[PDB]
Each structure stands twice: as C-alpha cells, then as structure tokens.
C-alpha cells in the first residue's frame, strides 16, 4: 500500500493545496518522509501529476514537474497527464506539459491520443501541430 506521505501527496495534489505539496516535496528532499513523487493511487494508477493536471492546480503541476515528476506516467486507462489536461481543456497546462517533454503521441488503452480525446478547439489545433513535428 502507499506510504502515509504518498497518501498526503495524492490528497493535496487532487485538491490543489499547493503549500502542502511543496512542504511534502521539501520533506522528501530532506528524506524526512518516504514517498515516491510518481506514486500512484490504489483502490487507479493516478499520479499526483495526473490529479493536479485533471483538476487544474497549476502551481502544483509546476512544482511537481520542477521536482522531477515523470511526465508520461500512465494511469490505469493508459492516459498520460497530457491526456488528462487535454481532455479537460486546460490550455496553459497543455503548454507547460509539452515544455517538460510530454509525449503527445501516446495512445491510451482506448486507442486515443490526447488530441483525439479533447473537445477544445484551441488545444486540438495545438496538438494537431505538435503531431506534425
């Protein structure tokens, strides 16, 4: 099962409590708690990065990437955080993820790219372009 600090990190990332994320990351840095920054929920495979992207907590997303969170982690559905940012139409977060070398080609378990999963016109244009590169 997940460590206590991992449970706290998932919880705070889901709800956007940005200072608690940074406090947990700082404690992980000083090795005062045992926690994987790429931990995954159980009970489904969603990282703190997945959650912060899906629910739009931009400061959390940035501090997680700054601290080295893996950017193409797949949840159970085969979705990346870019899938989740694109699905929920978060323009700024799509750009921030690409900045951190997020692979936009990844096909989820359903057979979709993040482009194919968005309903946003802007984001679909943006990923259309990245797809051409």
- The level 1 CATH classification is Mainly Alpha
**CATH level-four homologous superfamily name:** Ankyrin repeat-containing domain
Radius of gyration: 14 Å
Q: Gap between N and C termini, in Å? A: 40 Å
| CATH architecture annotation name | Alpha Horseshoe
Run of helices and strands: HHHHHHHH
- CATH-defined topology: Serine Threonine Protein Phosphatase 5, Tetratricopeptide repeat
Task: Kindly give the count of domains.
Answer: 1
Give the total of beta strands: 0
- Which structural class best describes the helix and strand composition? mainly alpha
Strand content: under 5%
Question: What best-fitting shape do the alpha-carbon axes yield?
Answer: globular
* Helical content band: 40-55%
Major beta-sheet overview: none
* Count, helices: 8
PDB class: endocytosis
Keywords: GTPase, Effector, Complex, endocytosis
Assembly: monomeric
Entry title: Structure of Orp1L N-terminal Domain
3D architecture notes:
The PDB classes it as endocytosis. The entry lists the keywords GTPase, Effector, Complex, endocytosis. This protein is mostly helical and 133 residues long. It has a single domain (1-133), classed as Serine Threonine Protein Phosphatase 5, Tetratricopeptide repeat (Alpha Horseshoe), CATH 1.25.40. The protein contains eight helices and no strands. It has helices at 4-15, 18-29, 48-54, 58-66, 81-87, 91-99, 114-117, 121-132. Helix 1 packs parallel to helix 3 (48-54), helix 2 (18-29) packs parallel to helix 4 (58-66) and helix 3 (48-54) packs parallel to helix 5. The longest helix is centred in the first third of the chain and has 12 residues, at 4-15. The protein is globular and about 45 Å long. The N and C termini lie far apart (40 Å).
């Amino acid at each position: 099962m997940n460590t206590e600090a991992e449970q706290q990190l998932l919880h705070h990332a889901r709800n956007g409590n940005a200072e608690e994320v940074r406090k947990l990351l700082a404690a992980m840095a000083r090795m005062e708690v045992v926690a994987d920054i790429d931990c995954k929920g159980r009970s489904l495979g969603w990282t703190p990065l997945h959650l912060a992207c899906y629910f739009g907590h931009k400061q959390v997303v940035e501090d997680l990437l700054k601290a080295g969170a893996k950017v193409n982690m797949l949840n159970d559905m085969g979705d990346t955080p870019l899938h989740r940012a694109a699905f929920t139409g978060r323009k700024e977060l799509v750009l921030l993820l690409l900045e951190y070398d997020a692979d936009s080609t990844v096909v989820n378990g359903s057979g979709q790219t993040a482009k194919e999963a968005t309903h946003d016109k802007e984001i679909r244009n943006m990923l259309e372009a990245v797809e051409r590169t």
